[PDB]
Design a protein around this ligand. Sequence first.
Ligand SMILES: CCN(CC)C1CCN(Cc2cc(C#CCOc3ccccc3)cc(I)c2O)CC1
Ligand SMILES: [Zn+2]
Length: 196
Amino acid sequence: SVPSQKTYQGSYGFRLGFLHSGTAKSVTCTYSPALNKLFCQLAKTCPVQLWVDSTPPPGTRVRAMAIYKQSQHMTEVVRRCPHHERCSDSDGLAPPQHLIRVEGNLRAEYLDDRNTFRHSVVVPCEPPEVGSDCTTIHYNYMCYSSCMGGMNRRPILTIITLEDSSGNLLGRDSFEVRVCACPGRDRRTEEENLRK
Ligand SMILES: CCN(CC)C1CCN(Cc2cc(C#CCOc3ccccc3)cc(I)c2O)CC1
Ligand SMILES: [Zn+2]
């Protein structure tokens, strides 16, 4: 089955936010609002903001999952390729098969769904650091979009869900991802293709 990707702010007014990192050739992570698409280098830090209008209950969690964007591929589980799943770049918590990791959160949990076989990573939803207006999660993507035997050039979406302590839906947002060598150039290219 295919998880829903419908944007849903829910009772707490949940939505994501992204930094404005620009498109210099050296940039390692950059988000395009026009494309709703994050471009990032392999295994590099991707800051994703969580914004709410009101405080969700203690025990609320935030889950990330990848799916293929194209209709003809949506039913296939997104996983790391046969090379990367074996490169022993473990952080001690993430299964080596999982495309999406949360970086630097000891409370991260990784799920292999018993029915759909899909992978996800979930962390507690926490209030912002003192002085801040939103909470930031740092994600890593552990294969290139081009990895043979993995994503194999097929575009993916990351779905972020706000969940209660039982796993029930409280909110949902999503964005496309391209993991590539030169996120700055690729964002510029794709934005120009869109303008054309
Ligand atoms: C005054 C401005 N107004 C927005 C208009 C508020 C700003 C303050 N924020 C608080 C806030 C809580 C949370 C959370 C949580 C669950 O854990 C809890 C742990 C302990 C206690 C409660 C919850 C996540 C986020 I992201 C977040 O912004 C809520 C919105
Ligand atoms: Zn790979």
